[PDB]
Amino acid sequence: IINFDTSLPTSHTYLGADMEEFHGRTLHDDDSCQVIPVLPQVMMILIPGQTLPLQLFHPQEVSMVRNLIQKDRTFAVLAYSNVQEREAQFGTTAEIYAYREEQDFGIEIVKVKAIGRQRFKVLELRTQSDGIQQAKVQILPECVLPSTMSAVQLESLNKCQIFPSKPVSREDQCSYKWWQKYQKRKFHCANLTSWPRWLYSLYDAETLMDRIKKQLREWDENLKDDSLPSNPIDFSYRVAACLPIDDVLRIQLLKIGSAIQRLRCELDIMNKCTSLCCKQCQETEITTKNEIFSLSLCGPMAAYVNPHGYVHETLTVYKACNLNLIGRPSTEHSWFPGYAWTVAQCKICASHIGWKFTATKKDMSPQKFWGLTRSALLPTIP
Amino acid sequence: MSYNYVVTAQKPTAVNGCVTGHFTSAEDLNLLIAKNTRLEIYVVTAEGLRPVKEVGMYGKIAVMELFRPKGESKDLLFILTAKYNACILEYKQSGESIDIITRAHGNVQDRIGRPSETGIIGIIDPECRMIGLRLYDGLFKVIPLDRDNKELKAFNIRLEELHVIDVKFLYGCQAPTICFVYQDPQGRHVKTYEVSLREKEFNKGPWKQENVEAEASMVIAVPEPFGGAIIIGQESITYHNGDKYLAIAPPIIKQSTIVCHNRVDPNGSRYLLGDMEGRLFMLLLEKEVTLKDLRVELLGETSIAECLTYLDNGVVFVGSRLGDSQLVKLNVDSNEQGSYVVAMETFTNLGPIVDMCVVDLERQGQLVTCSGAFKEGSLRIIRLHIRTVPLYESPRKICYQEVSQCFGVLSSRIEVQDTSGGTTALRPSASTQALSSSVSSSKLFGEEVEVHNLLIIDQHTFEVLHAHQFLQNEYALSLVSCKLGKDPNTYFIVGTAMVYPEEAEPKQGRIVVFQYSDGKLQTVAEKEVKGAVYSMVEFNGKLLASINSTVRLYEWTTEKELRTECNHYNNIMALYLKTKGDFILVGDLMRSVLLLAYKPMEGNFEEIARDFNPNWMSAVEILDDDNFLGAENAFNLFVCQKDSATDEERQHLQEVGLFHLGEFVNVFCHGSLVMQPTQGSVLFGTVNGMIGLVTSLSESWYNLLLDMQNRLNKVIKSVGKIEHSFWRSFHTERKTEPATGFIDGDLIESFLDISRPKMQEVVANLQYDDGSGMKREATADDLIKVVEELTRIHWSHPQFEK
Ligand SMILES: N#Cc1ccc(NC(=O)Nc2ncccc2OCc2ccccc2)c(O)c1
Ligand SMILES: O=C1CC[C@H](N2Cc3cc(NC(=O)c4ccccc4)ccc3C2=O)C(=O)N1
Numbered sequence A: 001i002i003n004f005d006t007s008l009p010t011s012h013t014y015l016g017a018d019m020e021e022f023h024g025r026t027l028h029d030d031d032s033c034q035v036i037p038v039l040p041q042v043m044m045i046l047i048p049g050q051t052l053p054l055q056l057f058h059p060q061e062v063s064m065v066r067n068l069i070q071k072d073r074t075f076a077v078l079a080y081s082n083v084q085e086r087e088a089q090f091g092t093t094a095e096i097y098a099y100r101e102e103q104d105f106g107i108e109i110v111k112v113k114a115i116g117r118q119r120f121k122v123l124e125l126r127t128q129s130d131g132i133q134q135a136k137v138q139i140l141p142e143c144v145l146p147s148t149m150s151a152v153q154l155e156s157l158n159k160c161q162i163f164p165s166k167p168v169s170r171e172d173q174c175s176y177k178w179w180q181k182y183q184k185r186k187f188h189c190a191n192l193t194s195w196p197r198w199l200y201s202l203y204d205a206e207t208l209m210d211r212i213k214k215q216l217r218e219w220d221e222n223l224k225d226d227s228l229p230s231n232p233i234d235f236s237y238r239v240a241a242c243l244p245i246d247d248v249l250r251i252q253l254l255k256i257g258s259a260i261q262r263l264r265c266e267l268d269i270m271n272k273c274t275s276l277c278c279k280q281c282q283e284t285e286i287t288t289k290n291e292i293f294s295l296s297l298c299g300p301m302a303a304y305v306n307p308h309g310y311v312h313e314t315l316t317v318y319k320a321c322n323l324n325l326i327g328r329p330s331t332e333h334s335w336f337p338g339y340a341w342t343v344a345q346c347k348i349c350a351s352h353i354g355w356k357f358t359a360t361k362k363d364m365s366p367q368k369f370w371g372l373t374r375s376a377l378l379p380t381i382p
Numbered sequence B: 001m002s003y004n005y006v007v008t009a010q011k012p013t014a015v016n017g018c019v020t021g022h023f024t025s026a027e028d029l030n031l032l033i034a035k036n037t038r039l040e041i042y043v044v045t046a047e048g049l050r051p052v053k054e055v056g057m058y059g060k061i062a063v064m065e066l067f068r069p070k071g072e073s074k075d076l077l078f079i080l081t082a083k084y085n086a087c088i089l090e091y092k093q094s095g096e097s098i099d100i101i102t103r104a105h106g107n108v109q110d111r112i113g114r115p116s117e118t119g120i121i122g123i124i125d126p127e128c129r130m131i132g133l134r135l136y137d138g139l140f141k142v143i144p145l146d147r148d149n150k151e152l153k154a155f156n157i158r159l160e161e162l163h164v165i166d167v168k169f170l171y172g173c174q175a176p177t178i179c180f181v182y183q184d185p186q187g188r189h190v191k192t193y194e195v196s197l198r199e200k201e202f203n204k205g206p207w208k209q210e211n212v213e214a215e216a217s218m219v220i221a222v223p224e225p226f227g228g229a230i231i232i233g234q235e236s237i238t239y240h241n242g243d244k245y246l247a248i249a250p251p252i253i254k255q256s257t258i259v260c261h262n263r264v265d266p267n268g269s270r271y272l273l274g275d276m277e278g279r280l281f282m283l284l285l286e287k288e289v290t291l292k293d294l295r296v297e298l299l300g301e302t303s304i305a306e307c308l309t310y311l312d313n314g315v316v317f318v319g320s321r322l323g324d325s326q327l328v329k330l331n332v333d334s335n336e337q338g339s340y341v342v343a344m345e346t347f348t349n350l351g352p353i354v355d356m357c358v359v360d361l362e363r364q365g366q367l368v369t370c371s372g373a374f375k376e377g378s379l380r381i382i383r384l385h386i387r388t389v390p391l392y393e394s395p396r397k398i399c400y401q402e403v404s405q406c407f408g409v410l411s412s413r414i415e416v417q418d419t420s421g422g423t424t425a426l427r428p429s430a431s432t433q434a435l436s437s438s439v440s441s442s443k444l445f446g447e448e449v450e451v452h453n454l455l456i457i458d459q460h461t462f463e464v465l466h467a468h469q470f471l472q473n474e475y476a477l478s479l480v481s482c483k484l485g486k487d488p489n490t491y492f493i494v495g496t497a498m499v500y501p502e503e504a505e506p507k508q509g510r511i512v513v514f515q516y517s518d519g520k521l522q523t524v525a526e527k528e529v530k531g532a533v534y535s536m537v538e539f540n541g542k543l544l545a546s547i548n549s550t551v552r553l554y555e556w557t558t559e560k561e562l563r564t565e566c567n568h569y570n571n572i573m574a575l576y577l578k579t580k581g582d583f584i585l586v587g588d589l590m591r592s593v594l595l596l597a598y599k600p601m602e603g604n605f606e607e608i609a610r611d612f613n614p615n616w617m618s619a620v621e622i623l624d625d626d627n628f629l630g631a632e633n634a635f636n637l638f639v640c641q642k643d644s645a646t647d648e649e650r651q652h653l654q655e656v657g658l659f660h661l662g663e664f665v666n667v668f669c670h671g672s673l674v675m676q677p678t679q680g681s682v683l684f685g686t687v688n689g690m691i692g693l694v695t696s697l698s699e700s701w702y703n704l705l706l707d708m709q710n711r712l713n714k715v716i717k718s719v720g721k722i723e724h725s726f727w728r729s730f731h732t733e734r735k736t737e738p739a740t741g742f743i744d745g746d747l748i749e750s751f752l753d754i755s756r757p758k759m760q761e762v763v764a765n766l767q768y769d770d771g772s773g774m775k776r777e778a779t780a781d782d783l784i785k786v787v788e789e790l791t792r793i794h795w796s797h798p799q800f801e802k
């Protein structure tokens, strides 16, 4: 990526940068019971590792947000398991951090931006007489686990548990000898137990993060190492948000309460053979994993809103096959500033898959790229 | 049923700390040894160690120090427990009575904080003004040692350096000074601070030294005639003082890391160093009031040592966690090494019991355990009578084959890569002296490769008869002895995985079937699988194997082939696999317990129940058809039940029991007549060489024993005044919980030790639920009978004191 700034997409300049911004963190204590409102027209798997821009039309939700600004501005997004019966078991709590009011055409329109924080289990759904839904919520705690060897550590070998700082672990050479030394010295006390060292390394957070980074660097060649957060929990949520997978897999990832299990599941999902297809014909391949690149700090997939309020998960790829351009490039709304768009449909589906972005300036390096919507994608396994 | 009874059969043998001082009296040299929850006191005489006292503590001993304040005629003992219970102990003798008196006690736990990576460090300054504890990163805790601090109040001072490796107190300074080594992005440095009790902060120290070796790990405080400190690293030994920097790089210490030290003479001219391989060094300091040079010489080889202590004249105690503890003599004569060591006494250490089996059930079963690691590896035969068979390599798993009268043991030995590319052994081990040997396939710097072997050991003589060497990079994980299908032959079955350093998840593995006939090992069948075989069990004439996250059942065909029958896919890794009839219990390392059943009509596996709760799990055992037992994080035991009084409740494994044991359990076995109102018998083996027994109880017995435990807690005086309920409370981070469903047999068996008047007050007003059917006032003799009948479910004990 040359002559393009990755900070433009993530700031959501299309919604407007004049939003009044609210600061001051609220966080319910672990395992307690809370009552939180739920927006009715938002059926998506909210991951704490992603944001949520929203534009609302109907009066009930605008009044709900208006008086919710006072009430800790926290609402719940339900992970709907079936859209018809609209039942769910888990969810995520997001606070409004950006918000503004319009009066265009004589109708109040509210634009807000939210970020997921906590996971919860829902007990019962109260349908208000006002038409909004308020749910009974129990906070699922964050499970932090000590080192596996802290329960058998020799008192004399505690002295040798501080290692010299890790060198470069990128490109190819990386620090492979350093990780061999790390395995030998950290899991030395595995000789007191029945399991070998590599088994304990398969359940070690740092090694799993290294493996995920190394795997990502092969497909996304321009990824520099500072992009991913250095905390296991934040890393696991960021990777979970960024992975283009189905609703069942995302709900499965959200059900996991420990960072280690989440990292292991993410590695399994990544290693499983994958290719992206439109769901109406699983025969018809659109994009491979080699063509996926991250145009923003949020990775290859993020959340955006069209002028009508619908939310699309957009995956940015270099070459998307089986697509039919309809119309001419236009810039009436700009998720990616400086890029026009044109609608795309599969050759025989005739269903909307995404948009073609055509560069307007004559010198930007990623001149032609494709944005596909996640709701129309299916990761076929050969 | 749900209610269980846990009793200690063999008390822990591993040594995790030892000090020398004047504890019993001013004229007596004493050796104090700490084992897990065990404290032993010895008077050092010319003929050896004379045992005097044995006291059990309500916790795991993390810090032991001897100090003498002003006005005291003899030393005091400071103990800090892993649950942060601290006490100061005194020794009192009144005639034939020996009592340990508690002078001060309290809990030093902080409500917020993260435990340090390098563990709990406890140091007492030479002049006995305070005690310094490093429990959490970034905080240093000081306890004043004035005579009115009965409850041990403490204050926290802020260390600006977060990653601290070692802390020590210096000698000769007018104000209390500490020295420590810390790590930052700039490297590793040495810094000194001054501790002020009056204003409670850190003042600047006498000196600061940036240039410290990158692998410096240990700090040695030098007594008054020299002063300063010595920093021990992987390469260099340095003496640090104001305007005094002496450094040496002896080639003899490059091969191994030094992990322990002890001061030989009171003037600090001599020190003893010990390394991870079992070598013993002496550090010599040359003087003119000032230091001139440092010299290092090698004395010889001992057991792999955890702690060293110099006793009397020329006698050194070697305390080992991996092997037998030793008493050695420092002769000037060099039999084979300069100032060689002569062994004079050895002490048993069952060490890290990895696997065990029970054999010869008739006349009384016998327990065979795989104990020790590296050159300390040995087989232990326990009947308490213990027999040791040295192997000189690490024993992993053991199984018994009654038809051939032999034991199959998986082992591994470390070998170095020679320049020619071949592997070479450092010492002759059991695998290299076998009468007959075979290799799976004929195949061909300074890197250590691990070679895995299968050994056949005779029942009567325990001589090694056959050794089998596996392929390159091959890891042996599981071993069973069983009959399959309609075949009358008995086979050894071994599950292996191919591990290469360039991939973390093993892509390949194989299952091998061996037959032992005519004194020769023959390979009958060989099967290749795409994964690692973590566990294998015998399931009603079929072989149940866990390959990665796949559970597979294998048939035995007439053509001596393994054939797949049914396949079940999980989202977890099946490390633990136990069966009872038609039920299969599957558990990964993250405590995610899964219960499956084999339905023979359809030939498929079905999921009955599950329970997912992230925690590190060490072992599981099936108690009965409804109860399952496991080892939790920290040192805890848990029991879960199924079908407790919708399909939601049926698919939930409800927890029933927690209990804090203090031991890390590796293996569970079913042995009942091994010793000849309890049901079942399960024996477990711990890292500290502890063997324990679990038996199931009923309603009335569990209620009566719990009531008796509550009454006994009010009468038994604990050392350090630690509460038994707090000690047995289930303890991990994020929560602590009271113990439920477990009866501690040790407190019940202590009932036979107390005096008659105290027994009467324990029993008084207890309404005895006699089995005859009428409830009546309990007499002391009835409870004596019940407790004796309870002690008749486990072995006798040897005598400690002399
Ligand atoms: N900060 C940050 C950050 C976080 C995450 C990412 N990438 C990712 O998660 N997947 C990713 N990327 C590029 C190429 C291929 C990729 O998967 C291929 C795949 C496709 C379908 C199913 C499963 C895997 C990032 O590029 C940046
Ligand atoms: O980069 C992007 C992705 C594209 C996206 N859209 C979608 C869109 C539909 C429309 N209605 C229409 O054409 C339309 C056409 C015929 C009948 C009725 C309506 C107007 C503006 C936008 C618009 O801007 C956006 O918001 N920015």
Ligand SMILES: [Zn+2]
Pocket (backbone or CB within 6 Å): A278, A279, A280, A281, A284, A346, A347, A348, A349
């Ligand atoms: Zn299509």
